[PDB]
Ligand binder design. Structure first.
Ligand code: ZN
Length: 744
């Protein structure tokens, strides 16, 4: 269905074939190749025999890639600093799972400018879909770096496309990495990621997929899309888009593994943790071919799709010449070490980038990794705090990722607190599940359902091997599924008046953006739906961003009519009035805002921002808004935070906030293109979540705080008056609330 002929293929003698095993199309220079180069059609050929002629570390390979694209003489790329693994710019995914997620939805739609075009990036990426594979297959990670060159071809502005992408890829592999040209295949296989899809190549070499080259030209299909949708790859329905995006992904770890030829990718990437762990646990060397064969055979073996690891192990057992029991005995301590090594690295990135362990979203996933790793350490017989293993990653990685050093105290404390609380969680959970298990076998069935085992973790915090040893006392039957953690992880993703009657009306001019001190204005009545009056312009603030609506009056024919509620539907502002019959279309009215109410809201709104700057400085840079609500008399600010705020801390925060009020710092706002705002201020802009639009309204307190914000603010901090913190309290794991009052 997709034509993927290129200039390079045509000019350089590449032959399109159909793989004799999987039937997929692939391109090769090798006249005797009949298979695509992808397991199980081909096998890993580089283990014990590096396919790249010189060895590379992570730092070397990453820089090799970045520099190649950056300094390219024909297609120079702008080097872009990696994004946090927490996608502050979007509300639809939990974690960055690919480099392209940095540029969705805003860059791809054309709502944001690309940071550079074309660009090159090495993006730390996290995926939980293969978590049970980690340590088991020799190749799977939860945390990895996807190196990428991206080009955003908006209509009318071509950058580069399919021809140049295959050439750049081939040039990097053959000229920079000295890989054998005829061993490289381009397998046609459509791809998708984070809302978009298109035709793609898998670039295969010595049995390993070393890159994916995706030509994104489709977007997630809207509900009830007509005749021509295209079904691709996982997600089904898509429709064409005008913008064509080059979406590449080169696995840093895989390329390093290709250069090392070690039994597992973990030995090539995580030796600095794997080897101390071996030594600490006193794990003796085992037969090297056990690891090698397992990795090789695992190339052909998925487990997250079918529960057949048992057969992978029967295969590697026969190959090695031992039984499955003695195989399990030998390899198990290594699987445990590999998982610990990987999980502690994932956590280093996650917590450094602002993930707070909790029972929700990405915090839920961090907590999952922490608990799994602690349980792995116990099975190894290793009595070491997890924070000590996390510390080994900070030590190794902080020179490339300075943020790890800067956040180290907080990262290690978060790990320590999670561990020390988990011991408590495990006592209470063990009894509650013992009672439930005893009650289930008392009257009903003595079998543990897979869903109840999932419920056991995410309700009582206990891992399935703990459940089974309590259960096999009375009321037996374990059956821990091979994909237990993959299923537990997927749990983290668990999810005024009318319209079309105001689609025809133009945008309400927002006079409150023109002057926050405007309290009176004249305007024309455009529409009266029920008791909602729509004006062409208004100084009435519509409820949003934690700030309640303005109230006041509209004066019509001398008569005063109360405005009791103000909302926004799309871009049209609606005013609730006590006497709608008084208002007719075309009528010009005088508006009067309840000023006491407005100014009290403004004091708490700007005061919230003053407080935010104080919170970040006292508590740490993981502090981020989880929620906000203002009233006339008080405000609340909810923040992601990992412990109770002590009374002394509260006073430190209060002193700092009031110091800034006393300094009377300027508070300013302006509209900026979103990528321009992001590159200048960072992702801290997105406190209240992510705001749509080509341009975002940025509210800045000089040298203190900056947020994308649509509220009414005071022009200086002195006008807030005293800030008095009344209360701190926990809302849930990972969320602390501060209640405060602003003004004399
Ligand atoms: Zn094939």
């Amino acid at each position: 269905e997709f034509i993927m002929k290129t200039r390079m293929f045509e000019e350089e003698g590449w032959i399109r074939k159909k793989c004799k095993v999987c039937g997929k199309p692939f391109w090769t220079l090798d006249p005797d190749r009949e298979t695509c180069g992808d397991p199980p059609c081909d096998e890993y050929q580089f283990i014990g025999k590096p396919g790249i002629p010189r060895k590379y570390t992570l730092d070397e390979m990453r820089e090799k890639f970045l520099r190649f694209f950056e300094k390219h003489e024909i297609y120079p790329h702008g080097r872009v600093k990696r994004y946090p693994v927490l996608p502050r710019w979007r509300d639809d995914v939990l974690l960055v799972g690919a480099s392209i997620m940095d540029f969705q939805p805003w860059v791809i739609s054309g709502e944001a400018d690309p940071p550079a075009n074309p660009l090159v990036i090495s993006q730390p990426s996290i995926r939980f879909t293969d978590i049970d594979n980690v340590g088991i297959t020799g190749r799977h990670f939860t945390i990895f770096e996807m190196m990428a060159h991206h080009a955003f071809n908006y209509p009318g502005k071509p950058i580069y496309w399919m021809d140049e992408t295959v050439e750049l890829a081939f040039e990097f592999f053959t000229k920079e990495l000295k890989m054998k040209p005829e061993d490289i295949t381009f397998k046609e296989n459509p791809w998708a990621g984070g809302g978009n899809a298109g035709p793609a190549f898998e670039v295969l070499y010595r049995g390993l997929e070393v890159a994916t080259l995706v030509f994104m030209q489709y977007k997630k299909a809207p509900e009830n899309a007509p005749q021509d949708q295209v079904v691709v790859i996982k997600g089904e329905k898509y429709i064409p888009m005008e913008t064509k995006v080059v979406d590449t992904g080169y696995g840093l770890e895989r390329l390093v593994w290709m250069s090392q030829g070690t039994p597992t990718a973990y030995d090539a990437v995580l030796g600095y943790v794997v080897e101390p762990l071996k030594k600490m646990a006193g794990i003796e060397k085992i037969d090297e071919k056990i690891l090698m064969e397992n990795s090789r055979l695992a190339g052909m073996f998925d487990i997250e799709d079918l529960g057949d690891l048992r057969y992978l192990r029967e295969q590697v057992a026969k190959r090695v010449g031992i039984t499955v029991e003695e195989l399990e005995k030998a390899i198990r301590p290594y699987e445990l070490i590999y998982a610990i090594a990987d999980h502690t690295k994932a956590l280093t990135f996650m917590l450094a980038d602002g993930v707070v362990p909790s029972n929700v979203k990405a915090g839920y996933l961090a907590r999952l990794l922490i608990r799994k790793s602690i349980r792995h350490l116990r099975e190894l017989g290793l009595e070491v705090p997890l924070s000590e293993i996390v510390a080994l990653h900070i030590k190794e990685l902080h020179k490339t990722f300075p943020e790890f050093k800067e956040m180290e105290d907080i990262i290690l404390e978060m790990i320590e607190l999670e561990e020390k609380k988990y011991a408590e969680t495990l006592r209470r959970g063990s009894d509650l599940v013992r009672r439930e298990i005893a009650k289930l076998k008392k009257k009903g069935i003595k079998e543990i359902p897979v869903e109840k085992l999932v419920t056991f973790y995410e309700s009582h915090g206990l891992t399935p091997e703990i459940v089974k040893e309590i259960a096999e006392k009375e009321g037996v039957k374990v059956n821990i599924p091979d994909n237990f953690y993959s299923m537990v992880a997927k749990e983290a993703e668990r999810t005024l008046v009318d319209f079309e009657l105001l689609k025809d009306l133009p945008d309400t001019r927002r006079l409150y953006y023109e002057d926050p001190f405007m309290k009176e204005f004249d305007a024309k009545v455009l529409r009266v739906i029920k008791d909602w009056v729509i004006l062409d312009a208004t100084a009435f603030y519509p409820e949003g961003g934690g700030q309640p609506y303005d109230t006041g009056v509209l004066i019509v024919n001398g008569r005063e009519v109360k405005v009791t509620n103000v909302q926004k539907v799309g871009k049209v502002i609606i005013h609730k009035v006590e006497d709608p019959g008084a208002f007719k279309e075309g009528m010009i009215v005088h508006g009067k805002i309840d000023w006491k109410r407005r100014i009290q809201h403004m004091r708490h709104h700007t005061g919230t921002h003053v407080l935010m700057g104080a919170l970040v400085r006292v508590l740490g840079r993981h502090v981020w808004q989880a929620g906000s609500q203002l009233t006339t008399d008080w405000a609340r600010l909810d923040i992601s935070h990992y412990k109770r705020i002590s009374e002394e801390e509260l006073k430190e925060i209060e002193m700092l906030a009031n110091r800034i009020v006393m300094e009377d710092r300027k508070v300013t706002w302006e509209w900026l293109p979103r990528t321009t705002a992001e590159q200048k201020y960072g992702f801290r802009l997105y406190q209240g979540g992510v705001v749509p639009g080509r341009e975002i309204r940025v509210v800045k307190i000089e040298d203190w705080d900056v947020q994308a914000c649509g509220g009414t603010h005071l022009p200086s901090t002195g006008l807030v008056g005293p800030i008095k913190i009344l209360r701190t309290e926990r809302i849930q794991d990972g969320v602390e609330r501060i209640i405060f009052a602003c003004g004399e």
